[PDB]
């Protein structure tokens, strides 16, 4: 089972943000969890099979979740600088069990007779998580990156240089996911001009990086080969 999150990685302040979640989707509910950078996880909401949607009480007026029975869309209106977070789509299990003590006697519709109040237990846990999606919140400007191949001067070390771009993030995949053993993508550095710059090297004992920059809708493929020497 897989789970993909789609949407814009950039949204300006005072603007509605809309995401979309697709997965391989009616056995369990679908939930949304966001994590502010350097903060705890934040429960946003969910929607079950029957269509019942639950929201976080602190933000219930701001966000809304729609579903088309296999895409669940989360819409948080009037974004701000505090909404910049990684939004995980998740399949969460929800179940409300009204419990009664020993005797097997329960009833609703407002020994057989009982004077013990009905206390209920709410079952909740995230079954499966998604890879995630970072949505940044700033006016700024989408500046695309320039990719340059990296090779030694003469194991063998190669890589790619994702230079001069904004805003974050950037996903660098080597060989469209085929090359994964030996790949190391470093975090970006913030230069004086205000643009980020990261690298992604691959170590070989004895090659085409696929750099994607979502804010500019950019997907550049760069072939890398060691120097002739």
């Amino acid at each position: 089972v897989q789970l993909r999150e789609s949407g814009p990685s950039l949204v300006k302040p005072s603007q509605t943000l809309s995401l979309t979640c697709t997965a391989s989707l009616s056995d369990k509910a679908v939930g949304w969890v966001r994590q502010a950078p350097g903060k705890a996880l934040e429960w946003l909401g969910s929607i079950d099979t029957g269509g019942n949607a639950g929201y976080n009480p602190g933000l219930k007026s701001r966000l809304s979740i729609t579903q088309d029975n296999s895409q669940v869309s989360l819409s948080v209106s009037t974004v701000t600088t505090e909404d910049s977070a990684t939004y995980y789509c998740t399949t969460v299990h929800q179940k409300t069990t009204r419990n009664c003590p020993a005797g097997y006697s329960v009833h609703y519709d407002c020994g057989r007779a009982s004077s013990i109040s009905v206390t209920y237990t709410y079952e909740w846990y995230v079954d499966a998580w998604g890879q995630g999606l970072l949505v940044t919140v700033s006016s700024a400007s989408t500046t695309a990156p320039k990719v340059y191949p990296l090779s030694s001067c003469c194991t063998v070390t190669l890589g790619c240089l994702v230079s001069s771009y904004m805003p974050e993030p950037v996903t660098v995949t080597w060989n469209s996911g085929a090359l994964k053993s030996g790949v190391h993508t470093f975090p970006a550095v913030l230069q004086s001009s205000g643009l980020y710059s990261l690298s992604s090297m691959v170590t070989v004992p004895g090659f085409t990086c696929n750099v994607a920059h979502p804010a500019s809708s950019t997907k550049v493929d760069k072939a890398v080969e060691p120097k002739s020497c």
Binding site: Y122, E123, Y125, L150, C153, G159, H184, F186, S199
Partner: protein, 215 residues
Amino acid sequence: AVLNQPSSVSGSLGQRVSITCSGSSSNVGNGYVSWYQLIPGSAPRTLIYGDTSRASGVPDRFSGSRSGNTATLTISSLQAEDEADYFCASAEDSSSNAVFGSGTTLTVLGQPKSPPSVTLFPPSTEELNGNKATLVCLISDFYPGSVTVVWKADGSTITRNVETTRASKQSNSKYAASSYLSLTSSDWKSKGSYSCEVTHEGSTVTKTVKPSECS
């Protein structure tokens, strides 16, 4: 509106470690606490659901518990791959309203130190065609994560135009960092040797590039 967790929790290698999730009667009082593990570079991992029930593919060392309004997560025989952020969560007043924990960072002590792996790349020919040069120095797989970086040009210490990132923790408990020397194209071919000197726990690793013998 977040469940109280300890900020930092440190345990020795192979030893026990407990993480308390101090809550109230509406959330942890409802007997359905869940636990989650957050490893850098990976999607969050569901550890325990419903107080004591382990998830799929989680070892027996990860045991969950709760006494009244307080749930704890116990990690026995702690390893280096257990270093992560752990969060507790439970429903509150509704099956679709859940609150998480403040977070607990697990740092496992007793790990052996490792020297940094330094790699220095010259400016690409394609970038040199725009009258610009950027030297990329990549440092990876060093523990602990304190690394001091200095550049040199033919023995003379560089200071200007240098931007170095902080040590980011890798997936294997070790740390990584990068350093960039943005230069003018004339400034790249204006020296004989450029060195990325990396110092870590006294042991210094250095890589050197020479524009004359690098084509």
